[PDB]
Structure 1
C-alpha cells in the first residue's frame, strides 16, 4: 500500500486503549531477546559539577566520564528550575491538544510529503521498517534566521518564547562544555567554535506514550546521535533511557533538575576516538508516559569532518577517514533506521 508512508500518531493509539501494539511496532525476536532489561550502572553515574568545572578535580571527573561512558549528568548548571519545568510543561500542553490541531504542525506536508521538521515520527524508508513507540516535535532553533515558525506551536502561546529562552541558556552551557573539553584534548577552543559558528541546532521534544507490551517495542530504537553532542532534559524521569557500554546495556536516570550531556558521532570523529559516542535507546512501560527534550548541536558545512590535526602527532595517527560534511550528514540520516552504525564505516 501507500498506508505505510503515513504512520499513526502513537499517543492516540495509547489513548484509544489499543489492546496490543500493532505489528508495525513489534520488534523481531532477535532484537528483543534482551528482555529489553538493562543492568544498573556499575560505577556511580558520571556526574560533573559545572560551577566547579574550572577546578582540576572536576575536569578529571569530566575526562573519566567522556572516555569511559561518553556521557555525564550535569549539576549546578545555572538554568533555573522554573525554566526547565516550564519548557516541559508547555511541551506536555502541546502533546495534549486535540489531534486535529496538532496535525496542522505535521511533518507530513499536506499529509503526504515527508520532511524532518514538524510533529510526527522519523522517516519511514521501507514498508517493513519497524516503527518506534513514540512521537516527536522536531524544530530548528539555530540559526535564528532559518527558523520556520509555521511549525512552532501557537498553543500554548508561551511555547515560542520559552523555547527561545531555553535554547539560549543551553547554548551557554554548550560553550562551557567545549571549553573544558578543549582543555582535556589540548586543542584551542577556537577549533570547535569555528565549526560551531552559525551551525544548525535542533530541539527534539519526545513523547513516549505507555505501551501495553513494553517488551515488544522501543520508545526510540538504539542509536548514537550524529551531532557534536546533545543536552537532554527529562520530566520526572522514572526510567526508560538505557545506554550501551562495550555491548552491555545500563539503565540511566536523568534525575530531576539536571541535564544529561552525551557526545555525538561528529565529536568522536573529530577527537579521533579519544572519546566515544554512546549508543542509547528508550524502553517504554505499561503505566506512564515519558517526555524529554534533546537540544542537538551539529557542526557547520565549512570544514570537512575528520580527526583534528592537532591530535594527530607521531604517536597517535588518524583512526578515522576524513569525510565531507554532506556525505557524513547523509550517512547519519540514512543509517538511523538501520542496524549498522554509520560511524563504523569511517574507521580505519
Structure 2
C-alpha cells in the first residue's frame, strides 16, 4: 500500500524518516501539502490537453535532445500512448524552445515556465530530504543533475478495457513526480515482497512520487526502483504530467561512500 506523506509535517526528522522508509520499502509515495499552486497544476493540465491537439506536423517538431525526450506518436509497440517532452527542464531556454516548437500561446508559455520551476523546486527538495534522512554530508548531490519534462496522452478504446495500457517498468532516473489524471487513474505498482500489485489512485491536488534506477544505484541498493504500470479501467482519454530528476549527464554515477561498506557491498 502506497503511503501518503504530508510535506508540511512540522518535524523534519519525522518527515525525512517517513520519506526514507516509504522510498526503501515501496519505492513510491504520494505527497500532499506539496507547495505547488493548485491552479497552476490545473492550468498545466489544460495546456497539455491543448498542446496535444496541435497539428501533427507541429508536434513532430518536438525533437529529441536525449533519445526519447521529444515527441512520440502511438505505434504498434505502444498503441495507446502519445507523448511530448523536453530535456533540461530546469533551463528556461529549454522550456522556451519547447514552447517555440509547439507554438505555445503567451499564456501557455508562462504556465509552462512557472510549472517547470515549481515542480523542479519540489524535486530538489525531496532529493535533499532523502540525503537528510540518511544523515549524509552531500546534501547538494543532485545540483548538477538535469531534469526532464514529459506530458502524456493515453487513449483507451473499448477493447482495451480490462487490460494494461503500457506494460510493467522501472523509471531510469533518480526520482519522478507525476501529476496523474484525477478523472481516470489506474496506475499500479509491484510490491517486491509478494509480487502482488497495489493501485496508485489519483487523489485530487496530490502528486505521486516514485524512485527510479538511478536512486537504487546511488543508495547502493537501499532505495526501491519501483516497478509500475498503468491499467485500463475504462475506454477513455487520460492525461498525465511527469517530471523526471535524472542522474548525472557526464559522469557515470556511483554512490556516496557512506552507503557502501562491508555489510552493503558495492553494486
What is the TM-score with the length of structure 2 in the denominator?
A: 0.87
Partner of 2:229: 281
Q: Distance in 1 between matches of 2:61 and 2:69?
A: 6
Of the three residues 54, 66, 70, the one matched with 1:118 is 70
* SS in structure 2 of the partner of residue 84 of structure 1: helix
Of the three residues 84, 91, 106, the one matched with 2:48 is 91
Contact 1:152 1:160 in 2 (8 A): no
Cα offset, 1:108, TM superposition: 8.6
Q: Distance in 2 between matches of 1:150 and 1:116?
A: 18
| Matching of residue 219 in structure 1 with residue 165 in structure 2 | yes
> In structure 2, do the counterparts of structure 1 residues 159 and 116 end up closer, same or farther at CA, with 3 Å as the change threshold?
farther
Q: Distance in 1 between matches of 2:100 and 2:169?
A: 26
Q: Distance in 1 between matches of 2:153 and 2:101?
A: 16
Partner of 1:133: 80
Structure 2 matches for 1:262-277, cutoff 5 A?
A: 262-277=210-225
Q: Distance in 2 between matches of 1:223 and 1:115?
A: 18
> In structure 2, do the counterparts of structure 1 residues 285 and 304 end up closer, same or farther at CA, with 3 Å as the change threshold?
same
Structure 2 matches for 1:223-238, cutoff 5 A?
A: 223-238=169-184
Runs in 1 of length 4+ with deviation above 4 angstroms?
none
What runs of 5+ residues in structure 2 fail to find an aligned partner?
none
Cα offset, 1:146, TM superposition: 4.6
> In structure 2, do the counterparts of structure 1 residues 316 and 300 end up closer, same or farther at CA, with 3 Å as the change threshold?
closer
The RMSD of aligned alpha carbons is 2.6
Q: Distance in 1 between matches of 2:185 and 2:137?
A: 38
> In structure 2, do the counterparts of structure 1 residues 93 and 301 end up closer, same or farther at CA, with 3 Å as the change threshold?
closer
Structure 2 matches for 1:1-348, cutoff 5 A?
A: 41=1, 45-52=2-9, 54-97=11-54, 101-106=55-60, 116-121=68-73, 130-140=77-87, 141-146=89-94, 148-149=97-98, 152-190=101-139, 192-193=141-142, 196-197=143-144, 199-215=145-161, 218-246=164-192, 247-318=195-266, 320=267
Contact 1:108 1:115 in 2 (8 A): no
* SS in structure 1 of the partner of residue 71 of structure 2: strand
Q: Bigger relative contact order, structure 1 or 2, given CA contacts below 8 A and separation 6+?
A: 2
Contact 1:107 1:116 in 2 (8 A): no
* SS in structure 2 of the partner of residue 158 of structure 1: helix
Contact 1:234 1:256 in 2 (8 A): no
Contact 1:118 1:151 in 2 (8 A): no
What runs of 5+ residues in structure 1 fail to find an aligned partner?
1-40, 321-348
What is the TM-score with the length of structure 1 in the denominator?
A: 0.68
